Design a protein around this ligand. Structure first.
Ligand code: PCW
Ligand code: PCW
Ligand code: PCW
Ligand code: P5S
Ligand code: P5S
Ligand SMILES: *[C@@H]1O[C@H](CO)[C@@H](O[C@@H]2O[C@H](CO)[C@@H](O[C@@H]3O[C@H](CO)[C@@H](O)[C@H](O)[C@@H]3O)[C@H](O)[C@H]2NC(C)=O)[C@H](O)[C@H]1NC(C)=O
Ligand SMILES: *[C@@H]1O[C@H](CO)[C@@H](O[C@@H]2O[C@H](CO)[C@@H](O[C@@H]3O[C@H](CO)[C@@H](O)[C@H](O)[C@@H]3O)[C@H](O)[C@H]2NC(C)=O)[C@H](O)[C@H]1NC(C)=O
Ligand SMILES: *[C@@H]1O[C@H](CO)[C@@H](O[C@@H]2O[C@H](CO)[C@@H](O[C@@H]3O[C@H](CO)[C@@H](O)[C@H](O)[C@@H]3O)[C@H](O)[C@H]2NC(C)=O)[C@H](O)[C@H]1NC(C)=O
Ligand code: LPE
Ligand code: LPE
Ligand code: LPE
Ligand code: LPE
Ligand SMILES: *[C@@H]1O[C@H](CO)[C@@H](O[C@@H]2O[C@H](CO)[C@@H](O)[C@H](O)[C@H]2NC(C)=O)[C@H](O)[C@H]1NC(C)=O
Ligand code: CLR
Ligand code: CLR
Ligand code: CLR
Length: 998
């Protein structure tokens, strides 16, 4: 095993710098989080009065508490207390360094980070979103990008190192061009017919579908027999393609043979594999087949390695924890059911747990396993599975990705107005007006009801602004030519936006101001901030670069809209209309009635004694092709995946009560879809995007896209500054009292002493915990005083020794700033210790954050971490441009949601602090879903359309006459936002990895 030992040594060598950066940044952010909000999640709403905790609606967990003005409030009759009960199995808080580090690792991996984000904001405050933004961008996105680049550069180095019958036969080879076109049209229309198989289809519709299927089968069988007759058995069987045609046709007729229709219910849709026959005319489908083929044939070794890894981990987890799961099932199981839904007793569920980990959800299944088993076994297994599992999956993803895709006065006035508009004064005025109007849309919130002055101010501002933007566009018309206006792309965006605004104002001032199309137009006022794309050079360049790839994006989008249609049809065939359930809606929470009391739809009417039995359907299901697509997307983004996976498994037959794990093997459908419409349908898009970017960068000759000329000269100047080989030494003065200090400093031990001192300061700051003993607190305070005093002493010593030559070094200034910041924080804490009127602990905590400079001082002593930070600050301009675009998109969708969903029932996804009522809350929700985290939860409240989930007769809430939303707009909104923010973040990753590649 010496060869593999050396290989892993080299691999860790390539991973050494990235691993150290990850560990160091994680530790720094863990200390920051600990100090900023330690012992804060313990808060719980407690009865005012052997204590009682209120529970969040739809959940059994206690309702967490905040005390500040911006943190989570508490209902009437309850006062918030610091009860010594950490939330969520008491395994998630910042009460100590270990827990803070685990929470920060979870935030980095984004494994349900939505829950931690919500809890921390609810307890600490709404102004601490900055910490989460910083850890997501600097921590999560950035560190993930460096790990990806490291693997990509590890693989590249590995590659571098490496009679009548005869008459019929004569007539049987017509093979006219019309034949193939007719066959293609036939299959297309067959798929179209099979794509309208819904739940409540009339018997006439069912008969029509049966007739269509049988006649199409007859046509395909006739073509098969006619072709095979045209040749002999020795021929027409030498090709895997016609072999596959034979398999599909024989399966089609064999299924027809049986009178039980679909025995497995997949045979009915097995006839959809022939849709791959469009591959011949579609190179995109051809390359999709090629990537799958390379997955099975080219990288088969890697694929089987991944398979054996998953199988082994699942089997080990089963054999180790199944007995404990069975014995203690009552601890983690839901209140009503007896067994845990996601457990590890049997091999199937253990493999499902391992697959969920590889999908990126392990904290909940680690919590449950810790509760129902030894904590030492759990942590080792889950962490090992996650790190090793996710590493193998990404290694395979990049291996397939590279292996495949890499192998009269009129003229006078015209000129005068041209000169006028060309003026930078007018340009800046227009930019200012656009940026003012963009931000002026944040005040049209739900809470605007109580403030009438803001309404009048906004109305007058918009009325003047639209006229200012009609004048601006009329000055453009009279200045520039009509041809060049209506040929430029941006001039339209402005013309259509102003047209929308003008017709909206016209409808408002005339009648018909409350009609549905006019309201929809008003909803389109959220596009107003979009006018700023043209006036900013960075955003204009970024959007030009994006639009340069729209053709390829659409080409891949079609080939994944078909490959998902296959699965949508197959799912609608497997279970359509079988998701309905009979629930017990007591006050605000429910459980499906036990099979004993109720067994089917009719029983819900016979047993309707209490009037609390409702027969309702899962919000997202496979009733028709549209909802099949929606569920497919929910499973693809790995959000809302569990709920449907429960409804599908608990389903027997139309109009029958769901039963616990009646279909325990229906998880395989979702597993197979995840694999195929995930891994591969994303690999294809990522390959196409990286080829399009390469060809758009090489053809135009301009690299480092997403950057303007000023940013380019800055980027040129920063590169020169970073690589400055020559340096001017500092002469040694003759005076002995300074020569002796210079001799001491020059010795290669001052740096070592400072390094060990800062390391010990880090350890001392780490040792602190929550509710520590007073002796520990006092010794820590004295040690902090000692450390700050010695650092200030040495800094002033060397500053005086170097005279004015101290500031020549770039980072000596940073050292001086951190030292003086420590001194100021100490003297600002000492003065606060007195009366000083009134103060709050959070102020002390934030003031004590200045100690992190003494930790950041270790950067200058790093090996490659300084280089990585240099690359980050070198990419900073491009990332700034793309972030500006992303924030513009976020503003657009925040206004859309803030105008569309202010009246919705607060379900498990939307609560008091994460609604769309106000601009701040809208921004929190939009930032949360920018990672596609919790978007299913935010979508669920608006998928509801009737009782018991709503009260369409609820007073006010006239958006839909009630307090529930419209799926038609909700699905569009959320799907479009997630796709757009996925493309934009992919652009960010491309920028970062191309910069690091340099
Ligand atoms: C959902 C779809 C899942 C899998 C894709 C299967 C592709 C089937 C292609 C049938 C057409 C065929 O037969 O194509 C033969 C031709 C020419 O072949 P020839 O005449 O040169 O010899 O070549 C080709 O285009 C195909 C060559 C590449 C094969 C790619 C697929 C490899 C494995 C996929 C299936 C694995 C099991 C999945 C189970 C899920 C449940
Ligand atoms: C992929 C395409 C379609 C996948 C569809 C889902 C897989 C199961 C299909 C199916 O109906 O399979 C037959 C049964 C279904 O069992 P059940 O859901 O009724 O639950 C058990 C309840 N009891 C014990 C009372 C019978 O399962 C069994 O025989 C277990 C073995 C089924 C193997 C299915 C493999 C599918 C994966 C990819 C292609 C290979
Ligand atoms: C953005 C994200 C990350 C990227 C970081 C990139 C690094 C940027 C700073 C370092 C840098 O690029 O270098 C800037 C210059 C270097 O000058 P030079 O060598 O070119 O001059 C040569 C002069 N000749 C020619 C005379 C020899 O100057 C310096 O390094 C001085 C930098 C001064 C920084 C002061 C910051 C300290 C203040 C606050 C500390 C707060 C601690 C608490 C934290 C709370 C919890 C998080
Ligand atoms: C092939 C890829 C390799 C992948 C990594 C493999 C290496 C790591 C394996 C796992 C090692 C785990 C060691 C600890 C084992 C359990 C020890 C144990 O008894 O639990 C201790 C705690 C649980 O405390 P509690 O009951 O909640 O009580 C609260 C408080 N402590 C009290 O005193 O009342 O629970 C803990 O032990 C706290 C755990 C903190 C975790 C910190 C984050 C780690 C991030 C990820 C690291 C790996 C990367
Ligand atoms: C990358 C692109 C490809 C992969 C991603 C594709 C994702 C597609 C998701 C769209 C699903 C649409 C969907 O499910 O429609 C459903 C909506 C709402 O129906 P309803 O009136 O409540 O009636 C319920 C009944 N069961 C029914 O379906 O009738 O039916 C409606 O009445 C809405 C009509 C418009 C739907 C438009 C959906 C846009 C999806 C955009 C996805 C890509 C984003 C970019
Ligand atoms: C959130 O804010 C509330 C309101 O300020 C805090 O309530 C207060 O909590 C303190 C500490 O538990 C209570 O102090 C004790 O009061 C009793 C008398 O009732 C006294 O004998 C003890 O020596 C001690 O001073 C205080 O009474 C209580 N106030 C009320 C009105 O209940 C709450 O602690 C805060 N929660 C957090 C985690 O900050
Ligand atoms: C919903 O599911 C339940 C349970 O499967 C169905 O209950 C069954 O209903 C029939 C008709 O009322 C009952 O039949 C009668 O049972 C008595 C007692 O055995 C017998 O003396 C009569 O001759 C007759 O067979 C049947 O017993 C009952 N099931 C059980 C287990 O008692 C119900 O009909 C279903 N509803 C629908 C409309 O699907
Ligand atoms: C068991 O009995 C209760 C009580 O009669 C039934 O409640 C009723 O359920 C229907 C369907 O969910 C509700 O219909 C809706 O009412 C709202 C107005 O409240 C209306 O806007 C909707 O268009 C729709 O008609 C109905 O209101 C509700 N009645 C009450 C008093 O809550 C329940 O459906 C029964 N369960 C079964 C399985 O039959
Ligand atoms: C992509 C290519 C295929 C598109 C396939 C498009 O198929 C559209 C149909 O599924 C729509 O069915 P409906 O929503 O009209 O069914 C309603 C049924 N009830 C409510 C009357 C019972
Ligand atoms: C043909 C198939 C040959 C055998 C398997 C070929 C190799 O399949 C690898 C995939 O299963 C790995 O993906 P995961 O299962 O981790 O799912 C992650 C999906 N996202 C996160 C990318 C969407
Ligand atoms: C990474 C380092 C930065 C992390 C995010 C740091 C986020 O800090 C936000 C501060 O505004 C917290 O509030 P303060 O303590 O400044 O003021 C308290 C005022 N009230 C709330 C009591 C009225
Ligand atoms: C361009 C203009 C917008 C820049 C961006 C403004 O910030 C947008 C979001 O970060 C939300 O910021 P908030 O200030 O609403 O954060 C919550 C504060 N309260 C409401 C809790 C006090
Ligand atoms: C279904 O819901 C009803 C209504 O909640 C339950 O009936 C009673 O509801 C009250 C609360 O309104 C509880 O205090 C009682 O304990 C419930 N029990 C009964 C039978 O009166 C009903 O029990 C629920 N059924 C099931 C099987 O959960
Ligand atoms: C870094 C030096 C000082 C310590 C060396 C030991 C290593 C293993 C470190 C890493 C994680 C550390 C632990 C992290 C958090 C806690 C919980 C706290 O309530 C007491 C200290 C304690 C238990 C720490 C002790 C030291 C520790 C175990
Ligand atoms: C029908 C139920 C049991 C689900 C099983 C999966 C079905 C639908 C599909 C998925 C992938 C398919 C295979 C994909 C590729 C090929 C190669 C081709 O040359 C002959 C058909 C064959 C061998 C297919 C057989 C049927 C298949 C296994
Ligand atoms: C609200 C409605 C009425 C607005 C409609 C605006 C439409 C007509 C605009 C928006 C973007 C425009 C395109 C943007 C850029 C170009 C390239 C150039 O060759 C001129 C035509 C063409 C292709 C434009 C055609 C018209 C266009 C599609």
């Amino acid at each position: 095993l010496k060869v593999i030992v050396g290989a892993l040594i080299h691999s860790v060598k390539k991973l050494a710098d990235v691993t150290i950066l990850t560990i160091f940044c994680l530790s720094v952010f863990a200390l920051v989080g600990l100090q900023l909000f330690k012992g804060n999640l313990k808060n719980k709403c407690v009865k005012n009065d052997p204590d009682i905790y209120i529970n969040k609606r739809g959940t059994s967990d206690p309702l967490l508490c905040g005390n500040g003005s911006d943190s989570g409030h508490c209902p009437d009759g309850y006062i918030c207390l610091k009860t010594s009960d950490n939330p969520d199995f008491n395994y998630t808080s910042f009460d100590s360094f270990a827990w803070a580090f685990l929470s920060l690792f979870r935030l980095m991996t984004q494994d349900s980070w939505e829950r931690l984000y919500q809890q921390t904001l609810r307890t600490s405050g709404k102004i601490y979103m900055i910490f989460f933004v910083l850890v997501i961008f600097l921590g999560s996105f950035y560190l993930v990008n460096l790990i990806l680049a490291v693997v990509t550069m590890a693989y590249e180095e590995q590659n571098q190192a490496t009679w009548v019958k005869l008459k019929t036969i004569l007539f049987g080879l017509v093979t006219d061009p019309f034949a193939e076109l007719t066959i293609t049209l036939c299959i297309v229309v067959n798929t179209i017919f099979m794509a309208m198989e819904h739940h409540g289809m009339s018997p006439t519709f069912e008969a029509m579908l049966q007739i269509g299927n049988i006649v199409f089968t007859i046509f395909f069988t006739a073509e098969m027999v006619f072709k095979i007759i045209a040749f002999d058995p020795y021929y027409y069987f030498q090709k895997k393609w016609n072999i596959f045609d034979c398999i599909i046709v024989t399966v089609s007729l064999l299924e027809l043979g049986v009178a039980k229709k679909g025995s497995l219910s997949v045979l009915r849709s097995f006839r959809l594999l022939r849709v791959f026959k469009l591959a011949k005319s579609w190179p995109t489908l051809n390359t999709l087949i090629k990537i799958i083929g390379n997955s099975v044939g080219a990288l088969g070794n890697l694929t089987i390695i991944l398979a054996i890894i998953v199988f082994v981990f699942a089997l080990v987890g089963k054999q180790l924890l199944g007995e404990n799961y069975r014995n203690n099932r009552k601890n983690i199981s839901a209140p009503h059911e007896d067994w845990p839904r996601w457990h590890m007793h049997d091999f199937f569920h253990s493999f499902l747990i391992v697959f969920r980990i590889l999908c990126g959800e392990w904290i909940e299944n680690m919590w449950a396993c810790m509760e129902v088993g030894q904590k030492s076994i759990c942590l080792i297994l889950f962490l090992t599975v996650m790190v090793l599992g996710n590493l193998v999956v990404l290694n395979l993803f990049i291996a397939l990705l590279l292996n495949s895709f890499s192998a009269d006065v009129g003229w006078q006035v015209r000129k005068t107005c041209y000169r006028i508009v060309e003026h930078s004064w007018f340009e800046s005025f227009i930019i200012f007006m656009i940026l003012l109007s963009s931000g002026s849309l944040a005040f049209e919130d739900y809470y605007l009801d109580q403030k009438p002055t803001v309404k009048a101010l906004l109305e007058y501002t918009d009325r003047v602004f639209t006229f200012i933007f009609v004048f601006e566009m009329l000055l453009k018309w009279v200045a520039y030519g009509f041809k060049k206006y209506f040929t430029n792309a941006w001039c339209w965006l402005d013309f259509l936006i102003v047209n929308i605004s003008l017709i909206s104002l016209t409808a408002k001032i005339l009648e018909y101001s409350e009609v549905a199309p006019i309201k929809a137009l008003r909803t389109l006022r959220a596009l107003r901030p979009l006018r700023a794309l043209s006036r900013f050079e960075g955003m204009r360049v970024v959007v030009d670069a994006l639009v340069g790839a729209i053709p390829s994006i659409m080409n891949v989008l079609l080939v994944c809209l078909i490959f998902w249609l296959i699965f949508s049809i197959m799912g609608v065939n497997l279970f359509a209309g079988k998701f309905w359930r009979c629930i017990n809606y007591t006050d605000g929470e429910f459980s499906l009635v036990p099979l004993s009391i109720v067994n089917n739809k009719s029983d819900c009417k016979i047993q309707n004694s209490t009037g609390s039995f409702f027969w309702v359907n899962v919000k997202v299901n496979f009733d028709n092709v549209a909802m099949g697509y929606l569920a497919l997307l929910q499973v693809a983004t790995f959000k809302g995946w569990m709920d449907i996976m429960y409804a599908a498994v608990d389903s027997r037959e139309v109009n029958m009560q769901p039963k616990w794990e009646d279909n325990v093997y229906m998880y395989l459908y979702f597993v197979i879809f995840i694999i195929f419409g995930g891994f591969f349908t994303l690999n294809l898009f990522v390959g196409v995007i990286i080829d399009n970017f390469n060809q758009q960068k090489k053809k135009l000759g301009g690299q480092d896209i997403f950057m303007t000329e000023e940013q380019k000269k800055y980027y040129n100047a920063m590169k020169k500054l970073g690589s400055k080989k020559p340096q001017k030494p500092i002469p040694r003065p003759l005076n002995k009292f300074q020569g002796f200090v210079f001799d001491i400093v020059t010795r290669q031990a001052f740096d070592i002493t400072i390094m060990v001192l800062i390391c010990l300061n880090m350890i001392t700051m780490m040792v602190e915990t929550d509710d520590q003993s007073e002796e520990k607190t006092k010794i820590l305070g004295k040690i902090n005083q000692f450390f700050v005093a010695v650092f200030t002493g040495e800094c002033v010593m060397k500053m005086f020794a170097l005279r004015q030559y101290y500031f020549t070094n770039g980072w000596n200034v940073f050292d001086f700033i951190v030292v003086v910041l420590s001194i100021a924080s100490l003297i600002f804490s000492a003065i606060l210790k007195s009366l000083q009127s009134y103060f709050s602990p959070t102020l002390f905590r934030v003031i004590r954050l200045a100690r992190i400079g003494r930790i950041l001082r270790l950067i200058r002593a790093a090996k490659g971490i300084r280089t990585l930070l240099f690359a980050l600050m070198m990419s900073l301009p491009a990332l700034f441009n793309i972030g500006l675009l992303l924030f513009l998109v976020m503003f657009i969708y925040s206004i859309f949601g803030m105008s569309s969903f202010p009246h919705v029932r607060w379900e498990a996804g939307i609560d008091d602090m994460f609604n769309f009522q106000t601009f701040a809350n809208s921004m929190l929700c939009l930032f949360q879903i920018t990672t596609s985290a919790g978007w299913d939860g935010l979508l669920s409240p608006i998928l509801n359309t009737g009782p018991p989930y709503c009260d369409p007769n609820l007073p006010n809430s006239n958006g839909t006459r009630g307090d529930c939303g419209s799926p038609a707009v909700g699905i569009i909104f959320f799907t479009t936002y997630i796709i757009i923010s996925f493309l934009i973040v992919v652009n960010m990753y491309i920028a970062v990895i191309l910069e690091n590649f340099n």
